[PDB]
Design a protein around this ligand. Structure first.
Ligand SMILES: [Ca+2]
Ligand SMILES: [Mg+2]
Ligand code: NA
Ligand code: NA
Ligand code: NA
Ligand code: NA
Ligand code: NA
Ligand code: NA
Length: 331
């Protein structure tokens, strides 16, 4: 199903930012490399541990990284030159979203920051509530349309914000606390919600996967799936990876269970991704498993290093390991 196309060691949960003729990848040690094909076009040293990235506009022209110390840096995607460097009151563990003239950042404090794309100035802030202990990591903000951004919160809610002002447009509860204790409160939506047409899906650490009809604002279903990873869709199936290492599929209109694969239990799975008519999910041994649409494993590609995130862009599957290895496959 997959043929290896590249295997690159990065100079020393970060995501690759694919470009039309290459890619941008950051090492957690601080080096952001812009690649043209398999050769380095540029490098930028952040002089700090990179905790969030690589964010990229849909036009492939500006890249964003967040550092452990709360710095947020915008880079020209072609040259690697910094456009601006600002310091926020909190660090980010997810890539920044670029929408319109805004860079939108989720942070440890629960604050969502709306930044001016040209200067990095803070235009707006939106505070979400965060339990004293929450699940480590966060969801990348998502542009619903030109005027609405969707935030997955540590409070288990989806927050819909006006892109220009930061004001809340609406919210929905997905993750549910089971009490006041530190374990019982854990309910993060740490996987970026999934939009297909006017339908919205999100899952949560506490075990709820909700499907929403954004046209009516109605809840279509709530099913059982504890997850910290982005969901994927395949025709009428919505599919996710559980915190137990299950891969499970639901009907994305009714919420009924389609299939559930237990072969990868406890392996530490990435988000599952859709590759054509197949599904791919990676694990902590560096193995990417390929599933058919009936949830049966038919193939396995192996890389070096633990995987936590898979990215599909056009025809290629991108994986960045914790060992700093970036692997690309085509399908
Ligand atoms: Ca979290
Ligand atoms: Mg998380
Ligand atoms: Na990266
Ligand atoms: Na690098
Ligand atoms: Na982005
Ligand atoms: Na962010
Ligand atoms: Na609803
Ligand atoms: Na998932």
């Amino acid at each position: 199903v997959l043929t290896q196309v590249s295997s690159i060691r990065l100079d020393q949960d970060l995501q690759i930012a694919p470009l039309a003729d290459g890619m941008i990848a950051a090492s957690r040690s601080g080096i952001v490399s812009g690649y043209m094909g398999e050769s380095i076009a540029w490098q930028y040293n952040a002089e700090d541990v990179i905790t969030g990235g690589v964010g990229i506009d849909d036009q492939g022209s500006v890249a964003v990284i967040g550092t452990r110390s709360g710095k947020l840096i915008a880079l020209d995607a072609r040259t690697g030159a910094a456009r601006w460097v600002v310091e926020l009151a909190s660090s980010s563990l997810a890539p920044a979203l670029i929408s319109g003239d805004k860079v939108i950042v989720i942070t440890n404090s629960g604050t969502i920051f709306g930044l001016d794309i040209n200067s990095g100035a803070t235009v707006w802030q939106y505070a979400t509530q965060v339990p004293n202990t929450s699940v480590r990591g966060m969801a990348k903000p998502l542009a619903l349309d030109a005027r609405t951004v969707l935030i997955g919160g540590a409070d288990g809610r989806i927050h819909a914000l006006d892109t220009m002002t930061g004001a809340p447009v609406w919210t929905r509860r997905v993750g549910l606390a089971m009490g006041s204790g530190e374990i019982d409160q854990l309910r993060d939506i740490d996987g970026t919600p999934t939009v297909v047409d006017h339908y919205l899906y999100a899952a949560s650490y506490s075990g709820q996967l909700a499907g929403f009809d954004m046209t009516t604002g109605r809840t279509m279903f709530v099913s059982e799936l504890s997850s910290t990873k982005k969901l994927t869709t395949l025709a009428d199936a919505v599919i996710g990876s559980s915190t137990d290492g299950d891969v499970v599929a639901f009907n994305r209109m009714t919420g009924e269970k389609l299939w559930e694969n237990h072969d990868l239990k406890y392996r530490g799975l990435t988000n599952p991704v859709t590759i054509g008519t197949y599904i791919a999910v990676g694990d902590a041994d560096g193995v990417v498993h390929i599933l058919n649409h009936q949830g049966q494993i038919i193939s396995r590609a192996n890389t070096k290093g633990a995987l936590t995130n898979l990215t599909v862009i056009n025809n290629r599957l991108y994986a960045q390991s914790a060992d700093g290895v970036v692997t690309v496959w085509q399908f």
